[PDB]
Amino acid sequence: WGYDDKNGPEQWSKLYPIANGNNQSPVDIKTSETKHDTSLKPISVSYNPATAKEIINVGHSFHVNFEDNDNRSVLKGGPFSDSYRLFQFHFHWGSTNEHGSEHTVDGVKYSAELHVAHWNSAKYSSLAEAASKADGLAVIGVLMKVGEANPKLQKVLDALQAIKTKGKRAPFTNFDPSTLLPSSLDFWTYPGSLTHPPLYESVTWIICKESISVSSEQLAQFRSLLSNVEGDNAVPMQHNNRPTQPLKGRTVRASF
Numbered sequence: 001w002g003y004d005d006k007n008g009p010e011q012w013s014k015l016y017p018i019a020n021g022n023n024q025s026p027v028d029i030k031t032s033e034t035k036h037d038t039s040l041k042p043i044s045v046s047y048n049p050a051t052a053k054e055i056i057n058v059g060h061s062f063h064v065n066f067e068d069n070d071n072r073s074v075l076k077g078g079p080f081s082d083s084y085r086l087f088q089f090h091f092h093w094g095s096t097n098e099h100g101s102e103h104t105v106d107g108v109k110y111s112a113e114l115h116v117a118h119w120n121s122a123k124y125s126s127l128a129e130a131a132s133k134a135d136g137l138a139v140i141g142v143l144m145k146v147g148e149a150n151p152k153l154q155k156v157l158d159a160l161q162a163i164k165t166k167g168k169r170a171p172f173t174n175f176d177p178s179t180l181l182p183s184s185l186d187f188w189t190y191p192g193s194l195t196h197p198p199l200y201e202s203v204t205w206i207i208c209k210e211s212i213s214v215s216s217e218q219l220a221q222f223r224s225l226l227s228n229v230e231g232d233n234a235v236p237m238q239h240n241n242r243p244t245q246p247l248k249g250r251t252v253r254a255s256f
């Protein structure tokens with residue numbers, strides 16, 4: 001599976017029939033069709049920078065993984081009774097600045113999207129068990145609008161030179177990803193899925209109303225990462241964004 005013509009999001013249903021399910025992500029948030037929900041608490045993030053572990057080139061993208069053995073790094077509040085434990089963050093981006101986000105707002109595409117992924121450690125023992133469960137994952141999505149260089153991205157961008165090719169990894173320590181989140185934590189939420197295979201309908205999405213910035217040059221650094229293993233012909237990671245999927249009667253709630 002991948003993002004190419006031959007293995008891309010249009011082909012995914014062949015290997016993963018859930019691709020055409022009823023709770024697929026991402027979606028276009030229509031602001032006129034959302035519903036202010038009264039019982040949504042604010043989002044509380046409390047991350048410990050010592051839980052940052054490793055940055056990895058996975059060939060379609062790159063992941064920053066966290067230690068998830070205890071509750072040092074948690075997401076609380078919003079639509080949740082339970083505490084969710086941080087395990088990874090990553091980005092999606094497009095061929096050019098014109099597209100790149102997975103979620104769209106009133107049909108407007110942003111240049112990139114930040115995902116912060118968490119698992120339900122109140123109800124399940126591991127990521128392995130939580131990952132396939134209706135209530136198992138919580139991902140925060142932040143839309144990234146092309147403009148001014150984002151200095152909080154610097155430590156991430158500075159690490160990419162050590163994981164240029166597929167399978168390469170390095171230590172990535174002493175990092176609190178709440179520093180990447182926008183000042184306002186006003187959000188939308190809907191029940192949904194992983195935006196790539198295995199596409200489990202296990203995700204409660206938290207989509208920030210406020211965007212963060214990224215430069216054209218910072219997006220060039222993402223696209224300068226390589227999908228091939230060391231010594232093969234260089235294949236740039238041009239894009240890794242899935243097109244928006246039908247709501248199929250689901251309701252997007254707003255905190256605001």
Ligand SMILES: NS(=O)(=O)c1ccc(N2CCN(CC[C@@H]3OCCc4ccccc43)CC2)cc1
Nearest residue numbers: 115117127128129131139193194195196197198
């Ligand atoms: N773009 S996104 O934010 O929707 C997003 C997409 C994919 C992920 N991945 C990590 C979590 N997923 C859990 C399933 C995983 O792979 C299958 C085997 C297996 C075994 C044991 C434990 C876990 C797993 C895998 C992909 C996370 C977030």
Ligand SMILES: [Zn+2]
Nearest residue numbers: 090092115195
């Ligand atoms: Zn993602």
